[PDB]
Design a binder for this molecule. Structure first.
Ligand SMILES: OC[C@H]1O[C@H](O[C@H]2[C@H](O)[C@@H](O)[C@@H](O)O[C@@H]2CO)[C@H](O)[C@@H](O)[C@@H]1O
Length: 426
């Protein structure tokens, strides 16, 4: 729809703060800005944009955008050299796919260890001391650590610690065959998590809501989350600190670093308006500040604003974890990778499969990626659309046939002519 910007951003982000930026944009242009946070938007967009529908701007971590770009769902972004200098070169790299920029980087996201200072004035430096720490806190009706076990994003830093990896980058290229979800290190990490559940230090059904409510109500001492969660803890009675993730087997947790990015829809008739909004309103000190005050973005891509946020120990902790982790690849295979790990973690945690069986299944799934789940139903969506045409065509032939020939139009008479065999049966 023309003369209008529709924006999709995840529900855990500051969509209200982003909406305020849109109203300032609307104040200056008269162009309404609608900000929405539909669930599973990173799955909807590749489907709805396949038929030229969806939002003008989509917000997500950069790791999904290579799939969109490969599918040709993204418009060209054209920041000049001057604008690119405003942002970190490595954040541009995160949104660079096959030498081509496919999205605007907004903020750098990395998981951190969040802890209750009143419950735990000095948080554990290692994963290893958490079991004994939980037993101690159970005696006081508390628990040590609760975090989202339904999303592999939260468990991957432990998995990758002793040698787990997704895609390696050598000779200026990813080896998409070389996936390391089933090795010694991945097994050691996932086994430890599973053992935590077997020894009743955690529960496999723990998701985002449960862990959040538990920590913010002072029921658990620690949690693992991103900057976006800080706002909800502020409103609670918990005195919390943000610190480096615990090490595993002497080695640091390696969280997948995500760069929140804003892509422009290829079907959007407002590509210039979207550029103006992103470059001159959002990606400014004032624009990012508005979003950040709602839900913390973390380490923003804009250098000028990040220089002020950098003094925040929470941000410093976020970057400390980011530096010990790897940037997420943006290649299309990332979607299939995450699906394999999610299934493996959930199946192993719930006890349905063992660690080795679950990770073997993940590795085999990694050997069998093609095409992406998103690619499959979007392609199906096209086929369902063309199917609609055949029925609609069938509807008009029978409709025209009910009309008197002397009252039929030129088109109706012409369309009826090239369906002689169908008309005769009708
Ligand atoms: O768990 C798989 C999932 O990991 C990442 O998603 C994160 C996202 O980056 C964060 O911003 C957070 O707020 O939401 C997700 C954690 O549940 C990948 O970006 C995503 O593509 C992937 O499916």
């Amino acid at each position: 729809e023309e003369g209008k910007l529709v924006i999709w951003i995840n529900g855990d982000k500051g969509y209200n703060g982003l909406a305020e930026v849109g109203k300032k944009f609307e104040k200056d242009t008269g162009i309404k800005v609608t900000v929405e946070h539909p669930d599973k938007l990173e799955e909807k967009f590749p489907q709805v944009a396949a038929t030229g529908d969806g939002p003008d701007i989509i917000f997500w971590a950069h790791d999904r955008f290579g799939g969109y770009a490969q599918s040709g769902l993204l418009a060209e972004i054209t920041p000049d050299k001057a604008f690119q200098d405003k942002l970190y070169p490595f954040t541009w790299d995160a949104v660079r796919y096959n030498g081509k920029l496919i999205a605007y980087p907004i903020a750098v996201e990395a998981l951190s260890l969040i802890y209750n200072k009143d419950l735990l004035p000095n948080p554990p430096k290692t994963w290893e001391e958490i079991p004994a720490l939980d037993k101690e806190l159970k005696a006081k009706g508390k628990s040590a650590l609760m975090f989202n076990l339904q999303e592999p994003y939260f468990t991957w830093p432990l998995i990758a610690a002793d040698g787990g990896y997704a895609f390696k980058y050598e000779n200026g290229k990813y080896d998409i065959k070389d996936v390391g979800v089933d090795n010694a290190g991945a097994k050691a990490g996932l086994t430890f998590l599973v053992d935590l559940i077997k020894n009743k230090h955690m529960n496999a059904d723990t998701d985002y809501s449960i862990a959040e409510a538990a920590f913010n109500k002072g029921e658990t001492a620690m949690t693992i989350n991103g900057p976006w969660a800080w706002s909800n803890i502020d409103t609670s009675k918990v005195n919390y600190g943000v610190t480096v993730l615990p090490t595993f087997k002497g080695q640091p947790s390696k969280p997948f670093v995500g760069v929140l990015s804003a892509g422009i829809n290829a079907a959007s008739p407002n590509k210039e308006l979207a550029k103006e909004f992103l470059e001159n309103y959002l990606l400014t000190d004032e624009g990012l500040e508005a979003v950040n005050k709602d839900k913390p973005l973390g380490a923003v891509a804009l250098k000028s604003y990040e220089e002020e946020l950098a003094k925040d120990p929470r941000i410093a902790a976020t970057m400390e974890n980011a530096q010990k982790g790897e940037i997420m690849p943006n290649i299309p295979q990332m979607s299939a990778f995450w699906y394999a790990v999610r299934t493996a973690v959930i199946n192993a945690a719930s006890g349905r499969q063992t660690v080795d069986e679950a990770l073997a299944a993940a590795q085999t799934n990694a050997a069998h990626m093609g095409l992406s789940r998103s690619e499959r139903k979007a392609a199906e969506r096209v086929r369902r659309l063309r199917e609609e045409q055949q029925r609609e065509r069938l509807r008009q032939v029978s409709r025209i046939l009910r009309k008197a020939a002397a009252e039929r139009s030129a088109e109706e008479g012409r369309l009826l002519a090239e369906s002689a065999d169908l008309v005769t049966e009708l």
